[PDB]
Amino acid sequence: HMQGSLMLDIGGTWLTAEDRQILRHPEVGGLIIFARNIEHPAQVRELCAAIRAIRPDLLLAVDQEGGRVQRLRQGFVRLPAMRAIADNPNAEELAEHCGWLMATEVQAVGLDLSFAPVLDLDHQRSAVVGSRAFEGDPERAALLAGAFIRGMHAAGMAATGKHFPGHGWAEADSAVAIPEDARSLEEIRRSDLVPFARLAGQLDALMPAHVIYPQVDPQPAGFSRRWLQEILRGELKFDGVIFSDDLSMAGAHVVGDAASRIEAALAAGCDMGLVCNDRASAELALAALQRLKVTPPSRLQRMRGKGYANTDYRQQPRWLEALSALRAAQLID
């Protein structure tokens, strides 16, 4: 039996009858919630509880978009960005507290995971070529995100890096065409690949970039056997979960419908296909998984959170200790 699974999403802040029926299918292994599914923490905890009453084994993920939920949604704990953390004598300690705080609250409301940390690099386009601004400091980026991952795991949450192998140098041409990064493999390996190489042993999952690297392979990372099998699993020895990219973002990347795209993603080596913002496409990908008679990836349940839904997390001593460490470093309040 081929292995594979589908992660999908819903329309609203509660489950419709159609949501409840699609979640029963065992090929569906996950659900991801976005800002439009989120009112406040109490509502999210209850939505997750409703989903687990149908499917206790489902993986429930939140995509926070660099922190949008904590911010357009009153009630979620509020945490410094990594730039603010990097500017401290105890930046690694402070990064751990943030990963711990973020993962503790996310699991408290019933989610398994947040898709974090970002491993992409900021490059200063117009800086002098070869200068530090031009290069983005990948070694420090991996240090801090490695400490952020430590806090995540200490709270019992699996860590997902993105977007492999790094979209920091990608260029878009016509806002519909697929972004490209035309450098050679050796150039990529020495820069945007570095945080992935440094942390591949610690990450539980990776999400591929929606970027073509033409000198390396004609296909986007997440549809590339070369990127996913040769380089990531082979050269980087990565043994965790590969998510696909959003299979319903398909601007000029013509493969066919979501059915033929999830087959392509699974064939390149992804474990779990993501189909967001398109119920009818999610149904098409589901049917494809059914025709292939897939069983879940043996790796999949590694993503399962070890914390648990609770309402008193904000009055636990460890919680107060982490916020008070962020306060003493002038990062909150």
Q: What are phi and psi of 66, to 5 degrees?
A: 65, 15
CATH number, residue 287: 3.20.20.300
Distance CA 322, CA 329 (A): 11
Cβ neighbours for 66, distance < 8 A, ≥ 6 positions apart = 81, 118
For residue 36, give the amino acid letter.
R
Determination technique used: X-ray
Burial of residue 212 (number of CB atoms within 10 Å: 0-12, 13-18, 19+): buried
**Domain assignment of residue 220, given as a range:** 1-333
Return the structure tokens found at 104.
Answer: 């503790």
* Inter-axis angle of helices 91-108 and 317-328, nearest 10: 140
Cβ neighbours for 125, distance < 8 A, ≥ 6 positions apart = none
Residue with tokens 């999610």, as numbered in its chain: 282
Domains identified in the chain, total number = 1
Tell me which residue of 178, 162, 76 sits closest to 121, measured CA to CA: 162
The Cα-based distances of 40 to 44, 158, 201, 223, 260 in angstroms read 6, 23, 35, 36, 37
Distance CA 138, CA 149 (A): 16
Paired sense of beta strands 5-8 and 272-274, if any? parallel
Contact (Cβ atoms closer than 8 angstroms) between residue 64 and residue 116: yes
